[PDB]
Design a protein around this ligand. Structure first.
Ligand SMILES: [Ca+2]
Length: 240
């Protein structure tokens, strides 16, 4: 997250860290959202490669023991059937991970709330992005969870020639673009929490940013619109 600030520890209990084994150690690669005691929602491009993955819940400081973590393996990766790695702008950047075991829900570990199917947010709605991704374009990962206010930019405006144009589809959600705050590599797969009816729900899964950089004016961070995949998600969890 570029231009953010440290989140109060465990204030976003559904946020998880997706790591892969590198030799004899692990490395944070993406964010994700715990939607079931044994299911995690993330980006398809995060699990595109055949590596060994593990999920960490109740995490805050990646380099220290906060005494609130739980580490569990991934036994099943279900990528959306239409996902095309060579055409991220085509959408479908979403995947579900069945955990090897069920996490225990407590003060630091809670399920994320999903919006109803087809829900579209009004322009400039209040949302927050969270993650351990780069704090600057070509910078380095943050070691403690970061958060930044990232209001939405509706489709009409986001798909215009002044912003993303044809790169963005209606199955996506845009937020930010103020040139100061934004998601960045390492935030991918993570959540976009938006305030609706008094509660925060996960409306997006971080997908991509501009090739020019993370925080670029009029180039909002692009997220997979969760409300467009509700049926798919349920059909997967119901039969797995
Ligand atoms: Ca820790």
């Amino acid at each position: 997250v570029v231009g953010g600030t440290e989140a109060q520890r465990n204030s976003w209990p559904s946020q998880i860290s997706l790591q892969y084994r590198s030799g004899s150690s692990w490395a944070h690669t993406c964010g994700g959202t715990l939607i079931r005691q044994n299911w995690v929602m993330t980006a398809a491009h995060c699990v595109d490669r055949e590596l060994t993955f593990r999920v960490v819940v109740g995490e805050h400081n990646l380099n220290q023991n906060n005494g609130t973590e739980q580490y569990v393996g991934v036994q099943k990766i279900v990528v959306h059937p239409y996902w095309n790695t060579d055409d991220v702008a085509a959408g479908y950047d979403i995947a579900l991970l069945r955990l090897a075991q069920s996490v225990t829900l407590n003060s630091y570990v809670q399920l994320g709330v999903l919006p109803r199917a087809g829900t579209i947010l009004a322009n400039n709605s209040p949302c927050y992005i969270t993650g351990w991704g780069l704090t600057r374009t070509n910078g380095q990962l943050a070691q403690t969870l970061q958060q930044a206010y990232l209001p939405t930019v509706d489709y009409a405006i986001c798909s215009s020639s002044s912003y993303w144009g044809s790169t963005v589809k209606n199955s996506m959600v845009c937020a930010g673009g103020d040139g100061v705050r934004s998601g960045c590599q390492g935030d991918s797969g993570g959540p976009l929490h938006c305030l609706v009816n008094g509660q925060y729900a996960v409306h997006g899964v971080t997908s991509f940013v501009s090739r020019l950089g993370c925080n670029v004016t009029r180039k909002p961070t692009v997220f997979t619109r969760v409300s467009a995949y509700i049926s798919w998600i349920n059909n997967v969890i119901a039969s797995n």
